[PDB]
Ligand binder design. Structure first.
Ligand code: HEM
Length: 137
């Protein structure tokens, strides 16, 4: 289930992080409007740009901690507060986070592997709710 999935992702986190984030950016190309440096780049290119590698590993390191601190796929309100308050996320709305989690669940659904994709779908919805409650637009 969900807690085992966190252990599976953590065991190859840099590969999973890059591959899910690319799934996100390829499913929702207008989302590169938050990442202008990523325009006109193939996946293999993006993987070779330092700020892509280093945002994406830091995104997934923190997302796995937030997932690990959750109860029944419901994140801590403190985790949502921390995420909202991040100066680098001033541009963003809950829509940006919803799209990341849609791509993450679709990635799990298409993988060869017994991920609990329904728990990730609830985690993504619950995080978006928590972000709204913490002050995200
Ligand atoms: C659980 C979800 C997310 C986490 C945990 C997260 C985490 C982070 C972290 C830790 C940083 C600091 C990394 C660094 O610059 O050294 C950062 C920066 C940033 N995040 Fe996020 N982020 C998340 C979702 C998003 C989403 C969905 C977007 C846009 C759709 C986004 C856009 C950005 C941008 C634009 C920056 C700074 C510029 C850059 O990425 O190069 N983040 N994020």
């Amino acid at each position: 289930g969900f807690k085992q999935d966190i252990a599976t992702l953590r065991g190859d986190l840099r590969t999973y992080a890059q591959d899910i984030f690319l799934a996100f950016l390829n499913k929702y190309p207008d989302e590169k409007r938050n990442f202008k440096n990523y325009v006109g780049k193939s996946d293999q290119e993006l993987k070779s740009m330092a700020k892509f590698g280093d945002h994406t590993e830091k995104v997934f390191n923190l997302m796995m901690e937030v997932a690990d601190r959750a109860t029944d796929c419901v994140p801590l309100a403190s985790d949502a507060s921390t995420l909202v308050q991040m100066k680098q996320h001033s541009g963003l709305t809950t829509g940006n986070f919803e799209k990341l989690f849609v791509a993450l669940v679709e990635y799990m659904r298409a993988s060869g592997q017994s991920f609990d994709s329904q728990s990730w779908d609830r985690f993504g919805k619950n995080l978006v709710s928590a972000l709204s409650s913490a002050g995200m637009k």
